[PDB]
Amino acid sequence: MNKWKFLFLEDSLVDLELIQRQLNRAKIDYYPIHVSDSEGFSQAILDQKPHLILSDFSLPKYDGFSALKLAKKICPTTPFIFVSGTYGEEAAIQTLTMGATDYVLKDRIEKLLPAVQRALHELEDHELRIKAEKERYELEEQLRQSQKLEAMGVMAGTMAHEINNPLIAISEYAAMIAKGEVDSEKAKQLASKIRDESARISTIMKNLLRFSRGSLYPVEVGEILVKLESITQQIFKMNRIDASWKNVEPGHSIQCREGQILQILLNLVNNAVDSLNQKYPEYDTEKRIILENSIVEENHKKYAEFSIQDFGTGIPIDIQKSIFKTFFTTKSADKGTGLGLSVSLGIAKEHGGSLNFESEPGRYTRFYLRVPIFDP
Amino acid sequence: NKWKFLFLEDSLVDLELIQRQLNRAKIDYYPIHVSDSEGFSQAILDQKPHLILSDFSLPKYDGFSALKLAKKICPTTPFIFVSGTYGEEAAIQTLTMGATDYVLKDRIEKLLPAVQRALHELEDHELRIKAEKERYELEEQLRQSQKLEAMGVMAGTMAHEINNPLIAISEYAAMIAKGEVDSEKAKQLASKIRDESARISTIMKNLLRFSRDDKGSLYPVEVGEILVKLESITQQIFKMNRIDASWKNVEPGHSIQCREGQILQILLNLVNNAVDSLNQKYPEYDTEKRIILENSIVEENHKKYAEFSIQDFGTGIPIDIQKSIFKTFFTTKSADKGTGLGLSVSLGIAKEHGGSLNFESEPGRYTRFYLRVPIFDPS
Ligand SMILES: Nc1ncnc2c1ncn2[C@@H]1O[C@H](COP(=O)(O)OP(=O)(O)CP(=O)(O)O)[C@@H](O)[C@H]1O
Ligand SMILES: Nc1ncnc2c1ncn2[C@@H]1O[C@H](COP(=O)(O)OP(=O)(O)CP(=O)(O)O)[C@@H](O)[C@H]1O
Ligand code: BEF
Ligand code: BEF
Ligand SMILES: [Mg+2]
Ligand SMILES: [Mg+2]
Ligand SMILES: [Mg+2]
Ligand SMILES: [Mg+2]
């Protein structure tokens, strides 16, 4: 609502006005929270979560020694600055040793602004560091999508080049028949050649598709979950996503290409992060993701179900039937290739599994991959 | 691991007692023995021991002075006192002075747990690096696999959009070949064959335009933004591969008409080739596993160009293949680690920018690739 949140523990309305006047001269955008006792101070820290505490030493019923001791217990990372008129500088330095972040004397109120600015500058710097890491990650991901598109482009080019020669032959033979440049008997021969060139195009593509494409082996389900956790923890941290796990079922193995199963799961996670960042551009308590594994039984067969539930935008009903189609994306093409869900569905079927989803618009989306357990 | 243990001890008899306890444990260590301050000081600097075991009372030298020096020169090296000169009440105090552990000579059985804990802490640090390296390798393996998967999906989609007209061509051709149609229907069917062949060409053109035309107009970009982004992306690459990366020159304040993302793709492609060449030549840590990254302004044919240069000292490029690199799908790496597309895409991108991509290499010594892009200057 308001950028900074400042907690003032102060009993003098006159001194509060003096302190605030110095901050307002700087056009600092802060939300003031004023408290004069231990209950208000204790409640305001927990419920309001201030980014900075400014405390008086002497309040009726409350003291800055107790306030500092409470702050070190409840909000250790929050900067705490004393601003008091009850002692000199000799006494004030000692308070820093007690773990105050800074100390401002009321008779030297000009010192308040540098103390506040340093604390705010340090807070911004911490935010700036996380942001630079997020931007670096996004740039790395854009380059990776671009390298993927170039390889697709090279494959489209090579297949077009090997096909155009027989395609030309088809057009010349058809043109000779259509032009009437051939007797009835040559037209049958040319029509035979057209069939052979059409069969050639189908074979060239088959040899190419086989060139562009390991055996399944038993893999422990737990090995997959540890790898998925290990890969996505940093993604959630960079995106400030809260990640919850509800259940696991290791000690069951599946016949899979482990790398391809992890590829499915990673694609769903990427869809969840994009959905979450679109709904919650800043930090929000509802920017959460649920990751679960479970054993499911279907048609008297047991399956390992991997589930990824995000609380982002959900999938609008008009597009929900069209989401596994190749190249379908609602993101601007610069950020979305539309290949994630279609590749994951292809891989899932190759493993004898299924990929399905449930979503309620504006609430959640849950994608789940089921793969049959290998029982020897 | 071949640990290196520095022993500051003046009694050869007590040294044999200490070493005998470690040798019973089959601890693989290299002993370094010193009895004075000069030998102790040199051994820390020159040999870089992984553990220091020190006596308190050596003639001409003392463990208080040893601790103070160790804290100045090798603060992170574990330091365990092993002395016969005092009791446990005095020994506990030595830990407060920053000894890692204290072993009494009369209780030499306590030496092994102190050493094992110190070695385990070193191993744990090595284990952490290994787990991070393995995680990074798996992420790169998954990304390479996804690139191969995308190529397969594009090959599949073009086959699906083409097969419908291919079926029609084959059916129409079959009716003509059987003679089941008069001469006028055969000409009409031949026209349909022509129309379906043109359709296949159009389907392919629309697919190729999505794969090679969603690129963007050229815009002026400042050279320095490209260099900072390249630095930020490759810092982690060099750290994971234990590559020493040096920059010889930069030339910001010059701009080029480019697709910034495509320029970074060239440079990143050259970097990946350097890392692979370097990893093939130096599988372990080596001081010559170095990379030189430079930018400069170059003049060619009375035109000024921004040159980005990447020089690795890895596996030189053999003369027989030097003439063939940059060809589409040419790779000497296995399929698990190479598609052969990096240099061919980079040469295309360089030409689309009015630039060139070139290289110099001496076999067994170094390779230098350099990308030239024209400076944007209306004047
Ligand atoms: N968790 C999620 N939340 C909201 N929408 C989602 C979603 N997962 C998928 N979608 C929708 O389905 C579409 C299909 O996405 P898909 O993964 O197939 O391609 P993509 O647009 O995500 C780029 P990429 O192929 O690189 O993953 C998305 O563009 C989006 O509109
Ligand atoms: N710095 C370098 N040192 C040694 N050989 C190099 C090299 N740069 C390129 N090469 C050689 O040229 C080949 C072409 O590399 P290119 O990048 O085009 O495809 P690639 O083999 O590296 C797999 P990818 O297409 O995924 O990058 C390499 O496989 C390698 O044999
Ligand atoms: F009451 Be306070 F210490 F200014
Ligand atoms: F001489 Be030592 F300190 F055992
Ligand atoms: Mg007061
Ligand atoms: Mg996706
Ligand atoms: Mg001695
Ligand atoms: Mg390469």
PDB file of N, CA and C in Angstrom, chain A residues 169-179 190 194, chain B residues 187 189-191 193-194:
ATOM      1  N   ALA A 169      10.287 -32.338 -58.889  1.00  0.00           N
ATOM      2  CA  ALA A 169       9.973 -33.401 -59.839  1.00  0.00           C
ATOM      3  C   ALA A 169       8.472 -33.660 -59.917  1.00  0.00           C
ATOM      4  N   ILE A 170       7.785 -33.678 -58.773  1.00  0.00           N
ATOM      5  CA  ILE A 170       6.327 -33.819 -58.772  1.00  0.00           C
ATOM      6  C   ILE A 170       5.666 -32.707 -59.582  1.00  0.00           C
ATOM      7  N   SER A 171       6.104 -31.460 -59.389  1.00  0.00           N
ATOM      8  CA  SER A 171       5.495 -30.342 -60.112  1.00  0.00           C
ATOM      9  C   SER A 171       5.766 -30.367 -61.625  1.00  0.00           C
ATOM     10  N   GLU A 172       6.982 -30.734 -62.050  1.00  0.00           N
ATOM     11  CA  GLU A 172       7.266 -30.863 -63.482  1.00  0.00           C
ATOM     12  C   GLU A 172       6.470 -31.984 -64.139  1.00  0.00           C
ATOM     13  N   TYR A 173       6.461 -33.169 -63.529  1.00  0.00           N
ATOM     14  CA  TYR A 173       5.679 -34.271 -64.074  1.00  0.00           C
ATOM     15  C   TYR A 173       4.197 -33.933 -64.140  1.00  0.00           C
ATOM     16  N   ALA A 174       3.656 -33.318 -63.090  1.00  0.00           N
ATOM     17  CA  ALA A 174       2.255 -32.913 -63.118  1.00  0.00           C
ATOM     18  C   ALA A 174       2.005 -31.857 -64.187  1.00  0.00           C
ATOM     19  N   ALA A 175       2.935 -30.909 -64.323  1.00  0.00           N
ATOM     20  CA  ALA A 175       2.811 -29.870 -65.341  1.00  0.00           C
ATOM     21  C   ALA A 175       2.850 -30.436 -66.756  1.00  0.00           C
ATOM     22  N   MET A 176       3.715 -31.419 -67.015  1.00  0.00           N
ATOM     23  CA  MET A 176       3.729 -32.036 -68.336  1.00  0.00           C
ATOM     24  C   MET A 176       2.400 -32.716 -68.659  1.00  0.00           C
ATOM     25  N   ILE A 177       1.822 -33.452 -67.703  1.00  0.00           N
ATOM     26  CA  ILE A 177       0.495 -34.026 -67.930  1.00  0.00           C
ATOM     27  C   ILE A 177      -0.552 -32.929 -68.101  1.00  0.00           C
ATOM     28  N   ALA A 178      -0.540 -31.931 -67.209  1.00  0.00           N
ATOM     29  CA  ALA A 178      -1.553 -30.880 -67.269  1.00  0.00           C
ATOM     30  C   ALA A 178      -1.423 -30.035 -68.533  1.00  0.00           C
ATOM     31  N   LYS A 179      -0.194 -29.821 -69.005  1.00  0.00           N
ATOM     32  CA  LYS A 179       0.051 -29.096 -70.245  1.00  0.00           C
ATOM     33  C   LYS A 179      -0.309 -29.900 -71.482  1.00  0.00           C
ATOM     34  N   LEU A 190       4.465 -40.965 -66.180  1.00  0.00           N
ATOM     35  CA  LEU A 190       4.737 -39.798 -65.347  1.00  0.00           C
ATOM     36  C   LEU A 190       3.953 -39.837 -64.035  1.00  0.00           C
ATOM     37  N   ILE A 194       5.367 -39.704 -60.247  1.00  0.00           N
ATOM     38  CA  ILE A 194       4.807 -38.853 -59.196  1.00  0.00           C
ATOM     39  C   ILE A 194       4.540 -39.643 -57.915  1.00  0.00           C
TER      40      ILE A 194
ATOM     41  N   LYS B 187      -6.028 -34.530 -66.827  1.00  0.00           N
ATOM     42  CA  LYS B 187      -5.480 -33.175 -66.773  1.00  0.00           C
ATOM     43  C   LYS B 187      -5.976 -32.419 -65.546  1.00  0.00           C
ATOM     44  N   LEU B 189      -6.955 -33.781 -62.667  1.00  0.00           N
ATOM     45  CA  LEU B 189      -6.260 -34.382 -61.531  1.00  0.00           C
ATOM     46  C   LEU B 189      -4.799 -33.947 -61.465  1.00  0.00           C
ATOM     47  N   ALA B 190      -4.140 -33.843 -62.619  1.00  0.00           N
ATOM     48  CA  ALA B 190      -2.774 -33.327 -62.666  1.00  0.00           C
ATOM     49  C   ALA B 190      -2.686 -31.897 -62.146  1.00  0.00           C
ATOM     50  N   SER B 191      -3.694 -31.072 -62.437  1.00  0.00           N
ATOM     51  CA  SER B 191      -3.749 -29.737 -61.844  1.00  0.00           C
ATOM     52  C   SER B 191      -3.856 -29.808 -60.324  1.00  0.00           C
ATOM     53  N   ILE B 193      -2.757 -32.191 -58.434  1.00  0.00           N
ATOM     54  CA  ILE B 193      -1.415 -32.575 -57.993  1.00  0.00           C
ATOM     55  C   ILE B 193      -0.505 -31.352 -57.902  1.00  0.00           C
ATOM     56  N   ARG B 194      -0.560 -30.471 -58.907  1.00  0.00           N
ATOM     57  CA  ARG B 194       0.228 -29.241 -58.879  1.00  0.00           C
ATOM     58  C   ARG B 194      -0.178 -28.371 -57.700  1.00  0.00           C
TER      59      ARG B 194
END
